């Protein structure tokens, strides 16, 4: 029946683009992951380095009264 | 290495030196000493499970952690305690926090007072169930993180606060919170496919009005045919504002019957969609 | 047409999750960025520190 | 007419397999990051306690010195609900993965400032004891 | 916990000691501890929420902690000062921000000094509506990513300034940016698929063209039918590039309605087509 | 720039001083210098590919930072000689993980406590093959998780402690943390989705129950028919609870023969729906 | 206040002191001093977008601090320097993040070694073009990521190592790579939707092998016709297995045209199947 064949037409364009939209935040998204992965680069850069110079400063007093 | 043990050495250390014992020094020294002491003892009462005692424990050491005069760490500790009693079976869950914020807020530090905060009111009303509050709290933690330009969590907040504002008869209280984080969101092209939500809970929410706040709402909002994410939104409120203006309680109840398929609807929506069902119920027969 | 309906909503129910999904970056927005700049100007303050403790060791080692 | 209405929306679930597919493949690599940047942050906690503890052996130290085609069509139908649904275990997984170490940042920040503020009074702490 | 008060004891302390104040030493160690009054002062008069005076209070601290020789917590200090005057009454924020990057770029910290240029000219638009002062911010500060390794926050610069280039009139201008963040953009395979945006945009922004410099940003294209994503950029290009060459501000302004169907419309794109439908016209009539 | 050079200079220096050798002062230093040495060492051995070598380096540098007093350090190498038994070729790299656990525990850490033991569990299964150990570290691991009010974690563990219980034999053990890990999953509307499986796992446990445990678990559900989700979950249940409660060993597995049509049939699902096809023909010759 | 002034200043100090002027002590600090001259010139040549001034500025402030005793900044000094170069116009990026390397190596940091290392074989790739040393960077890299269980990583590192070893004609050493990257992805059922390609990947390189390693490769692959993902891998291969053992060009080149339809092919895919496309051809006219 048309009115079956057309409203799954309709109804499917009404199904694929109610992907695309879910599709743009895929890529938004991936998008961002990426963008703010390199946050975590630094911040793993940092941390350890922090400890580093935060290390020889407990190392320095502590011999600065021994 | 007994949590007893502990708690008794602390408490022998704990107490402003005087006479013999002062000699010639002390002060934080040994007060530190014991919040190190009850530290340890709460973290063998969470161990053997006791939560009651682990959670009273850092309650001590904070407390006295504050004699010594070191706020920060101090109200670290609060928070060990808040999410102890919170996971425990004693109260205090709500005091340990508010002696948190207290601390946070004056120290000059917003950024946690809202991280908190929103903890807070978001115990307020899943326990005490006391949602006047939690709005309270809600609101003026939103209004830490807007200026911290957290505009995320801003919203986050925001929305828990319009949320329960309607389920507790704000509704025009929560339409405003909706238009404001709903123009708050466009500047984000990445909160464009969200702010459709916002419209279609300030369209749903209703303070009685007579006049076309919803039907005026509905067009504010900018739609097209090539939407599939906005026929979750107007598409569905358009057919629900003829619905209501015109008395026909089998429209509204059939469309929301439908609707009910490509979107379900939660709790939030049945409570206020059921409000607005009966606003005309009681409307018709009368 | 069933099938049809049928994978409707479904898909429309992962939209739904990206939603959260999306409100679940902005938060990792707010933590890093603050964070990070806080976590970069340690090593600023710690440095400085390091120094200062090295006039310490060359008058009291 | 419906001979265009199915051709065209078999055309358009081409579409929409692809779509998804080629975006799970993204998601796959959103976890995969996920699962690193975990890591990159459980190495993060590992500072943030160290910090903490070792600012506090300064301090003591230093305030010490101090003091047919509808067939095929509808198999395709089959598939795109089996993906969709599909789509959300990922979508699910990277939700919790997310809240957990969102959670985990939240530490981090806090006792963050507790050193920074920390490392800055051993700072004056510091300048106060030479000579 | 008086913020007049404490503005007050800040001044009393905040100058170079001299003679029986001085003693033998002196100078950073008071000039700190008068900042940290100040701030305690803005912190309560945001407690107010006097905001307004909160930010010009962190003025006085920031300024105050360079006379000091710390320009880093400084800047810090002028960020905050920003973030209170953009959530309250005055419009200073501007000022506070251009003299917290003149620091982070006299100091070398490009990273953090792109990472609040971008939001500089972000409110030199959303508030002061000064496009020719955000461009040139949005451009220095993609400069500055771009040498930071960080491609992908270089993009999102980069299409800010192209994005409102064109709306400015600086079409040719923006083109060029379409162009080189499209080649800078296939090199990693997880942006391919967005990369069909920039070729349509950088073919619809024309200099009064009257040629193929569209048709062969089009043609540049690879478009793959079997990769149904390119169907929201090039296949619509080809149709419009011929409503064009054909004066026809029909089949144009029919095919931006059809297209308006599978792929809605953002702002930016409307503004765009109006304008070259309007190129149209003005040729048909001449 | 020799490993067993190292190792020799760093023991002839890790003794205890007394007597003429300790001087003035004790020897807190000396330690620590054998272990950067036995570090140093581990290090090259890593870069020979020696692995066992420096996995075993590591736990001499490990073990003296013990007896220095650097609990935390020392936990971390324990976790390095772990990493390195573990990619290694010999054992050792249970212990370690136990050892480092061990301190992060007493230390107060319950945190990465838990993230170290989840990761020995899934060690302890997928490699030494020992569910039943393996089990009781991930549900310890999820309690210290819950202990964090993680919710999202501790789901995490939970779910590999009911998956593999239920595997194993356990399956009111297995229904109960469904049914703890489903009601701790409703209140957060952002798990909402995944609750069905709890449910259809939960039911799939039979612990020999001949009534209609799992027909009033399907009863206890919220499906609705508008909601599509739900049907790869109860709708296959009622026709298998038919099949069961009918001693049918082909509408079952015939059920199940559709299904995998609809819903790929994982490993996990198959093994039980076999076991349960066996309780079934257990039941029609009984 | 400008760097060409600063270079100098650096120079007039960074000399070994003696007689009068040095005493005792030497000056440790003052090679340090000059280490900070440097990075403040390099700092405004960064400003002033000099870049290849910069870069060699940061070489110099890193040799320097090596010329004192302290490998840990200096090697992050080689890093700034490279980034500079990088973002800079000549070369010494690769320079620069050798001695970079060699120090996070030797001192054990491999973790940030593997970060680096990375970048490295991308720059030796995509810019001096030398595959060659590209892929035993990428390998190399990847190894390390695997001691720190960094499998995400590790494999991100692998995929690349195979990829451009399929071009340069290693199809065995390709196969092999995809295998083992492909049993380290099913532990994992967040990487089974990739493995496919991985098992196509492996299926397509051939080694010149008459057997069945793909007919081999393509059974060991476990597929469900009802399935859907997997469409995309195996289903497609046995269709180009059977055009290979049959020396027909025709219904090879015509599959690899209709699944080029569901499924766009890549510039890697391509390559090769014009390679066993030309093996047909090159097994027909002989």
Known sequence: ?66 | AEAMALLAEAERKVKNSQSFFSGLFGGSSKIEEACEIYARAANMFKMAKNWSAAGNAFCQAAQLHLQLQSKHDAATCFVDAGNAFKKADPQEAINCLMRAIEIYTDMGRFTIAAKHHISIAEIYETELVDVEKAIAHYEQSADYYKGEESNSSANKCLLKVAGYAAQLEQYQKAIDIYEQVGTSAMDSPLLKYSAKDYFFKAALCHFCIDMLNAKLAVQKYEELFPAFSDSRECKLMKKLLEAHEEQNVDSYTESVKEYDSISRLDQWLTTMLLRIKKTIQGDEED | NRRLQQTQAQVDEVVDIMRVNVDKVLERDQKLSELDDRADALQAGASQFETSAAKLKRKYW | RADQLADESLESTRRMLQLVEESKDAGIRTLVMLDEQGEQLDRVEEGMNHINQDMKEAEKNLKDLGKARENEMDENLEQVSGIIGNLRHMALDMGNEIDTQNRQIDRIMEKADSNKTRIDEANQRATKMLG
């Open chain 1, 1 to 66: 029946a048309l009115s079956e064949i057309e409203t799954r037409h309709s109804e499917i364009i009404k199904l694929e683009n109610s992907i695309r939209e879910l599709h743009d935040m895929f890529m938004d998204m991936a998008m961002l992951v990426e963008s703010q992965g390199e946050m975590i680069d630094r911040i793993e850069y940092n941390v350890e380095h922090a400890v580093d110079y935060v290390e020889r400063a407990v190392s320095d007093t502590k011999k600065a009264v021994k």
